[PDB]
Design a protein around this ligand. Structure first.
Ligand SMILES: Nc1ncnc2c1ncn2[C@@H]1O[C@H](COP(=O)(O)OP(=O)(O)NP(=O)(O)O)[C@@H](O)[C@H]1O
Ligand SMILES: O=C(C[C@H]1NCCC[C@@H]1O)Cn1cnc2cc(Br)c(Cl)cc2c1=O
Ligand SMILES: [Mg+2]
Length: 460
């Protein structure tokens, strides 16, 4: 009951449920597919939100808030069974049903024509941090697929294709950094196939992550070039620099709290949650061991707490008298605190302490004067190690194939497949980083000549 009783490989699904609850990330809720985000989970969202905000602001993107509700006729300008409908206020029916936003396309693009008259009004760059609701038919999973989820949705409109297209890939790399620099998760940039892209999009760029334990790919984030599709539909036009009426070129992009789930599944182990330092409130936990003047142990630990905190490194000194040091060890490992500092009589004797990494459980005795410096670079190295170990697993999950039997073998081993492309397992994306393609290569399913490599696999 106390700790994680299932192993990540043996029973991944039950391991996941145990980790997210016992590490105090979420609480389950009496509405299926909805979950309470406890402070530990929301801190992660706050962090990546702060990062993403800073970066998109550099791209002159402005934050805004559009209404949670959209009327029936405006929404209705193959998704409808996912729409949640507000019908009643109190005991009175609404004259017209109103929908809860599943996304803000119809809400925003209905007003864009009013804001866009000439080239002078361009580019228009908007972003929202909000919630949307979708009554997912597929089985709900905490973070990964929820019926209400926090996200960010960006929407832009430009004078031409090139400015729009560049921003699409600018945003896509921000998503890359989002996962890499804060969640320590490696992702693959790519273009969706025509059958997998957002229907309203010209093309859909994507960031894909992969979970080796169940052999499933997860779309980490999206970034669409919408072209003039929505511009035509909503009559979003502007007057040229040459007085000619033109359609705007639009982009849209989004990343949700699914990112947190991807992080958990990536870095979590059999001991429980493992947090990248950049998304953990407490970077260090200080645990005291008695046998010995207790008050002297308190003074030493508090001194180290002051040293770290003064250097703007948030940490916690677990001085709860009712719990053994061993209990505290597991307590904070479970909650994913990157670093544990142990202080006992022996450490107090040499004016030193034991520092313990959460990721590989490596221990080392450091002098009190070197605690700060060693802590700082250890937090750096922990993030590097988490990312690199994760990248190795991602890379080792892809097999380059040129035949059907090679595909069957990879599918049976829960691997992803990199196959020739000439345009349940499905096409995931056409990776931006293309390996060389032999001149006379064919798709083994069509015989047509291959132009690029496509990534295939099962997905969430
Ligand atoms: N219910 C959900 N909970 C969490 N994240 C989600 C959910 N639905 C979609 N996302 C993610 O939100 C981002 C953009 O969503 P979106 O463009 O609506 O894709 P989508 O068409 O809903 N994909 P899918 O629902 O799996 O067929 C992607 O990274 C999705 O993985
Ligand atoms: O939501 C999208 C496309 C983009 N909109 C916001 C930015 C990120 C995102 O990729 C695809 N999508 C997904 N699910 C939907 C569910 C409903 Br219900 C509706 Cl009306 C519409 C949609 C819908 O448009
Ligand atoms: Mg969907």
């Amino acid at each position: 009951i106390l700790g994680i009783t299932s192993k990540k490989i043996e029973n991944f699904s039950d391991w996941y449920t145990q980790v997210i609850v016992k590490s105090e990330l979420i609480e389950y809720y009496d509405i299926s597919g909805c979950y309470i985000l406890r402070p530990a989970a929301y801190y992660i969202w706050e962090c990546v939100q702060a990062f993403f905000n800073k970066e998109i602001k550099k791209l002159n993107v402005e934050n805004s808030y559009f209404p949670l509700f959209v009327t029936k006729n405006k929404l209705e300008k193959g998704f409808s069974p996912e729409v949640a409908w507000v019908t009643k206020y109190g005991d009175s029916n609404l004259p017209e049903e109103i929908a809860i936003r599943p996304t803000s396309e119809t809400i925003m693009y209905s007003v864009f024509p009013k804001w866009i008259r000439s080239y002078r009004d361009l580019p228009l760059k908007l972003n929202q941090w909000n919630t949307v609701v979708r009554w997912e038919f597929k089985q709900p999973t905490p973070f990964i697929r929820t019926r209400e989820f926090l996200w960010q949705e960006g929407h832009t409109a430009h004078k031409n294709e090139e400015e729009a297209v560049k921003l699409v890939f600018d945003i896509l790399d921000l998503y890359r950094r989002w996962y890499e620099e804060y969640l320590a998760v490696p992702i693959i940039k790519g273009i969706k196939s025509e059958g997998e892209k957002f229907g309203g999009a010209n093309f859909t760029s994507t960031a894909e992550a992969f979970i080796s334990e169940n052999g499933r790919a997860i779309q980490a984030a999206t970034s669409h070039y919408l072209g003039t599709n929505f511009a035509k539909m909503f009559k979003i036009e502007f007057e040229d620099e040459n007085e000619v009426k033109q359609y705007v070129h639009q982009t849209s992009w989004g990343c949700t709290t699914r990112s947190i789930g991807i992080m958990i599944m990536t870095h979590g182990d059999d001991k429980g949650l493992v947090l990248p330092p950049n998304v953990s409130k407490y970077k260090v936990v200080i645990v005291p061991i008695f046998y010995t003047d207790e008050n002297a142990i308190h003074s030493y630990c508090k001194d180290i707490e002051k040293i770290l905190k003064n250097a703007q490194i948030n940490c916690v000194y677990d001085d709860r008298a009712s719990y053994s040091p061993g209990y505290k060890f597991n307590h904070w490992e479970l909650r994913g605190i990157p670093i544990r500092i142990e202080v006992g009589p022996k450490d107090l004797q040499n004016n030193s302490c034991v520092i313990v990494r959460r990721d590989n459980n490596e221990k080392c005795n450091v002098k009190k004067e070197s605690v700060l410096l060693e802590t700082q670079q250890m937090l750096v190295d922990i993030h590097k190690n988490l990312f690199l170990k994760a990248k190795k697993k991602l890379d080792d999950s892809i097999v380059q194939v040129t035949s059907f039997s090679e595909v069957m073998n990879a599918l049976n081993k829960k691997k992803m497949v990199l196959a020739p492309w000439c345009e349940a397992m499905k096409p995931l994306c056409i990776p931006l980083d293309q390996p060389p393609m032999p001149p006379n290569m064919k798709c083994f399913w069509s015989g047509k000549p291959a132009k690029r490599w496509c990534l295939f696999g099962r997905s969430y």
